[PDB]
Amino acid sequence: DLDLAKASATDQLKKAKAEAQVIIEQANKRRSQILDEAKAEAEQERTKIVAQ
Amino acid sequence: DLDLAKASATDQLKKAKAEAQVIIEQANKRRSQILDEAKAEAEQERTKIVAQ
Amino acid sequence: TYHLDVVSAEQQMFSGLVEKIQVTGSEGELGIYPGHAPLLTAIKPGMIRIVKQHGHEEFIYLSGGILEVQPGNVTVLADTAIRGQDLDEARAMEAKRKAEEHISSSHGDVDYAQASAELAKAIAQLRVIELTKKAM
Amino acid sequence: TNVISITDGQIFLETNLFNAGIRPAVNPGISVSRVGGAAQTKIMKKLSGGIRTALAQYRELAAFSQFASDLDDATRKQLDHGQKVT
Amino acid sequence: QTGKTALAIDAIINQRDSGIKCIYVAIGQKASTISNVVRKLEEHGALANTIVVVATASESAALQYLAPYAGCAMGEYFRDRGEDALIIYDDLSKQAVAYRQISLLLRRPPGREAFPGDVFYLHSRLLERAARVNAEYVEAFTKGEVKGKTGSLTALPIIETQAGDVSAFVPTNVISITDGQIFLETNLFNAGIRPAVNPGISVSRVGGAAQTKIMKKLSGGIRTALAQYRELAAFSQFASDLDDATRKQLDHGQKVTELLKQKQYAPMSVAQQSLVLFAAERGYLADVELSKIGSFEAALLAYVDRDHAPLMQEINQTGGYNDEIEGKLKGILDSFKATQSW
Amino acid sequence: AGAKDIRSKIASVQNTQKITKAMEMVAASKMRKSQDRMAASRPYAETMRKVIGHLAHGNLEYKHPYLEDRDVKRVGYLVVSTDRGLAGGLNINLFKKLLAEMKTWTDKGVQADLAMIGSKGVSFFNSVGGNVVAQVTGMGDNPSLSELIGPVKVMLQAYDEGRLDKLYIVSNKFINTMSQVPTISQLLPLPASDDDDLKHKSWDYLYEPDPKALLDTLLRRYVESQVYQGVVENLASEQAARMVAMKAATDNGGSLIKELQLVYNKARQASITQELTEIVSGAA
Amino acid sequence: QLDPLVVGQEHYDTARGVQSILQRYQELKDIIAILGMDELSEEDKLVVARARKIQRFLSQPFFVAEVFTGSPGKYVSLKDTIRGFKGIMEGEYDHLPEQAFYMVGSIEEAVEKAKKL
Numbered sequence A, B: 001d002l003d004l005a006k007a008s009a010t011d012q013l014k015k016a017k018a019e020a021q022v023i024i025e026q027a028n029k030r031r032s033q034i035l036d037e038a039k040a041e042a043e044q045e046r047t048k049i050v051a052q
Numbered sequence C: 001t002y003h004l005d006v007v008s009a010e011q012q013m014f015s016g017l018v019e020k021i022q023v024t025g026s027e028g029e030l031g032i033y034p035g036h037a038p039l040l041t042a043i044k045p046g047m048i049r050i051v052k053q054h055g056h057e058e059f060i061y062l063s064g065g066i067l068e069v070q071p072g073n074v075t076v077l078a079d080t081a082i083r084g085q086d087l088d089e090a091r092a093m094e095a096k097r098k099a100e101e102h103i104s105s106s107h108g109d110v111d112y113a114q115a116s117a118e119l120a121k122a123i124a125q126l127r128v129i130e131l132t133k134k135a136m
Numbered sequence D: 001t002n003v004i005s006i007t008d009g010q011i012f013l014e015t016n017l018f019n020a021g022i023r024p025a026v027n028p029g030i031s032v033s034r035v036g037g038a039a040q041t042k043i044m045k046k047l048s049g050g051i052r053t054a055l056a057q058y059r060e061l062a063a064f065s066q067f068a069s070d071l072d073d074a075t076r077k078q079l080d081h082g083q084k085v086t
Numbered sequence E: 001q002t003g004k005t006a007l008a009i010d011a012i013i014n015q016r017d018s019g020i021k022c023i024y025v026a027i028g029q030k031a032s033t034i035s036n037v038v039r040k041l042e043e044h045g046a047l048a049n050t051i052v053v054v055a056t057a058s059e060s061a062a063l064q065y066l067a068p069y070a071g072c073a074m075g076e077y078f079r080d081r082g083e084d085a086l087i088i089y090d091d092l093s094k095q096a097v098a099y100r101q102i103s104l105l106l107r108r109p110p111g112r113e114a115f116p117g118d119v120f121y122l123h124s125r126l127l128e129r130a131a132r133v134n135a136e137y138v139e140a141f142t143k144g145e146v147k148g149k150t151g152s153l154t155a156l157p158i159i160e161t162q163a164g165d166v167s168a169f170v171p172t173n174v175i176s177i178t179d180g181q182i183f184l185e186t187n188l189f190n191a192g193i194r195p196a197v198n199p200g201i202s203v204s205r206v207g208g209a210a211q212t213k214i215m216k217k218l219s220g221g222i223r224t225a226l227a228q229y230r231e232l233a234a235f236s237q238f239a240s241d242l243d244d245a246t247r248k249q250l251d252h253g254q255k256v257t258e259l260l261k262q263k264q265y266a267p268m269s270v271a272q273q274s275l276v277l278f279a280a281e282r283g284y285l286a287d288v289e290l291s292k293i294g295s296f297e298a299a300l301l302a303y304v305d306r307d308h309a310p311l312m313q314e315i316n317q318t319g320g321y322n323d324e325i326e327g328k329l330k331g332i333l334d335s336f337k338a339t340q341s342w
Numbered sequence F: 001a002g003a004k005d006i007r008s009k010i011a012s013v014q015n016t017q018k019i020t021k022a023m024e025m026v027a028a029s030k031m032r033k034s035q036d037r038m039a040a041s042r043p044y045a046e047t048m049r050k051v052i053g054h055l056a057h058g059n060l061e062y063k064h065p066y067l068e069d070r071d072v073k074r075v076g077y078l079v080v081s082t083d084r085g086l087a088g089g090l091n092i093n094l095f096k097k098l099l100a101e102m103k104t105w106t107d108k109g110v111q112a113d114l115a116m117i118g119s120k121g122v123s124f125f126n127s128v129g130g131n132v133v134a135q136v137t138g139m140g141d142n143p144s145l146s147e148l149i150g151p152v153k154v155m156l157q158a159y160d161e162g163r164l165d166k167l168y169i170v171s172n173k174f175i176n177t178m179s180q181v182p183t184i185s186q187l188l189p190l191p192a193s194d195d196d197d198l199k200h201k202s203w204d205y206l207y208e209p210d211p212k213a214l215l216d217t218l219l220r221r222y223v224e225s226q227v228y229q230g231v232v233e234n235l236a237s238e239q240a241a242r243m244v245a246m247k248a249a250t251d252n253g254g255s256l257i258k259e260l261q262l263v264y265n266k267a268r269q270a271s272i273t274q275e276l277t278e279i280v281s282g283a284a
Numbered sequence G: 001q002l003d004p005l006v007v008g009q010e011h012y013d014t015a016r017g018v019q020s021i022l023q024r025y026q027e028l029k030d031i032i033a034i035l036g037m038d039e040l041s042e043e044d045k046l047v048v049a050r051a052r053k054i055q056r057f058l059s060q061p062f063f064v065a066e067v068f069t070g071s072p073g074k075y076v077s078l079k080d081t082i083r084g085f086k087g088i089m090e091g092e093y094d095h096l097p098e099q100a101f102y103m104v105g106s107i108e109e110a111v112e113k114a115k116k117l
């Protein structure tokens, strides 16, 4: 059980780290989405302002 | 020897339970940083384009 | 204790100091203690028990061989594969067939294959001689 | 350069082939006809494609000729087929 | 097409906030490239600090031949006042062609490749104006209005080779003029190694005298380590099942060569380069041997930018290095490995 | 000529030289691993030959066909050869020595048979027309005894069945890291031990079950090790010969570079002058 | 213009994967030539087949080449091109012959030719 506790500690560490990685890649994606929305709003704003 | 084994197993599991919480709290911190800086850039670039 | 060698035709398998051993000779089980009289026998495929001095026990699997024991020394000329009247004849039959045909296999040296093909393509068609004026 | 630029194709005759006994010493692959099969009887057009592909595979394998007997048999067949077409 | 213009205008953009003024002379460039260059220079905020001199591919050869001298005069204005300027000549190997044209149209006798006789004296008398000038010169030139300053002008001429034959005529002239070369290799560029700088064949003969102390300390091995890694990895293809000692050199080299490549318009300050090279040199990469190593770099930069900004300030301001800073960097790397994810 | 055409061939020969250097390095490492595996094989044959000498030339010398010189009317050879080229002259010296001795034997009118280890000899002797009767090929760097069992079994069966006599093994003796010599050695009838086991007087083995059926197996296993030993020595000799050959090839490439560069220099000088003279002479 | 920022990550990844597969096949070609194919590892025996099918699929019959071949031409949208190569590289068509991809238009013609073949 001592070596099983060793393996448990290591597996728990790596599971927590791979669980954090999905939170991060999620933030990166949200970012990529919201910046695209901002760029598109800016583009349409330019179109209307220049047409005026 | 078995009362050493119990001590060691419990201590190392406590260590790993601390480490996992630390890792995922820092993951949420990174998420907050990414999202807030994305919110800032979503205005910086829009203002740039609408002045251009 | 006495010295024990377990030796195959390819590489050595055990060279420690031993206190006793147990084997299945062709004529029955058999236990060698120190000072055993000189003896020669075949041994059947199976396990052999070594006890290293200080009493450490371990099991070595042998595919057969010949056990020869001497005053204060012993050796197991172990076989590397199972041997038999039928198996060896099957292998000889395939070795003969491969020669009565002209069938040949491919060596496993992928490194030599890579380097040889690279050098064959690099050296090809380069018209160096008659470019340099080298007679030879 | 000028005449190779003007004409519709080229027949390249090479001395290394002529010396080796390949006569007429036309060098295929390096030689082109842009009219192609349009200027052939349909039987010849049918039969020529396998000759083109055989000599192309032979040109790909020819580097290994002077290392033959080292090669696999599956490529040995292509190598000794291209020699027979030549 | 190996990233010469990209490297040049990134070297320009990186001068946003140093005392160095920037000048970009384009010789024989097609107008769309200049439009993109100006859009990128104003997008990243570098345009307010640079002069752009343009002689496009369709303008008369006289305008292309004399463009770099106008740019050199505009930068020498700053040089002579005790300030710092950096000037990039884009395709001197096209100024040579325009000069050849203008020379042949005047019936002047030709030379080795039809380039006129004085084509060396074309580039020489240009690149010899890139100089650092001592305080007495600037004091006497400006008639005593500036006392302590030393002026300087830095030149980054660009040369295009054909199939990498460095030994061509104009390339081997300009290599005989300058004080070094950043050779960009095409087969590294196509393999995704960008910027594709080739170690060994590329050198700076001014060298470490122009290098900040921390960078000089961290970078000493990298060049020879990478050249020997490249030759060893050339050997490797023919040798499978190879010694486990070289097995480690051929992996550290493969990680450092994977670390020294980065996105195009992303300049990196001395501190961000310094701690990354520290991580790479002191073995902290030896357990990331799976090539998920771009994420490692980005996460390390973000982590250090959040917590220890007071150390990045010190590094950026002083460039100094100490056993105390060594310990601080050990602490940063240990705290990063143990508590974050790539 | 043509300056570009010559620079292309300079580049090609430099690439060839680099390939040959890499091959020299690989061979120089495999040679060490092979010649250590060669030393790992001695104890078996040594400690078995002592036993065979005790049962054969000791007291109560037993009688066995493999120990005595029946009259010779046909001969057999086990031939070990490489599976890979670029080993220099290694294989052809050995095959020529074998053909010399095998022709001397057929002058006396005796017939001869061959068993082939390795692909190269199999390719050669069918071209010469030799009477190969068993073969194993594709051993590479991993020669097993459990694959040599076959053809050695064929030759042993043909011997005790009365057909063959006085069979041989031909192989390359690894002597120095740059010196390997082709040798033909006799395995059966058993060669004569230099040593005497008269000093073994004072003891005798307790043979279980019985000494004759046991000497038979001892002798069969012994020829096998000696063959296996011949195969492994030949493999280390192959590695050493390839090392030397690629060394020589790298130096030959390094001299062709000198010659091609002299030609390239002359070509580029002539091109510069032939262009500039046309330009200057064209201007009326 | 072949970078993720202008063509999208899907197109860029498909193109780089096609080039990587073909480069690996060009490497394996000479081990196949010397040691025969039955010596390749079972994942390399799959790289070989997938590269060989890619190398067929990016041929195409032109409308103007008809007078040279008689067969009709085909126009392939970029979406179908990416879908076809991305499918082949991922093994969705490991069950079709190689000649099912030669001189076809969209991948639907590949599956329909194999069904006919």
Ligand SMILES: Nc1ncnc2c1ncn2[C@@H]1O[C@H](COP(=O)(O)OP(=O)(O)OP(=O)(O)O)[C@@H](O)[C@H]1O
Binding pocket: E001, E002, E003, E004, E005, E006, E007, E160, E194, E195, E262, E263, E264
């Ligand atoms: N570090 C980099 N990362 C990714 N892409 C890059 C990088 N550097 C350059 N590129 C890309 O490579 C292409 C060629 O770049 P660039 O024009 O700078 O090379 P060049 O040698 O100046 O071209 P040429 O001299 O042929 O006009 C550009 O489209 C650019 O997007």
Ligand SMILES: [Mg+2]
Binding pocket: E001, E004, E005
């Ligand atoms: Mg450019």
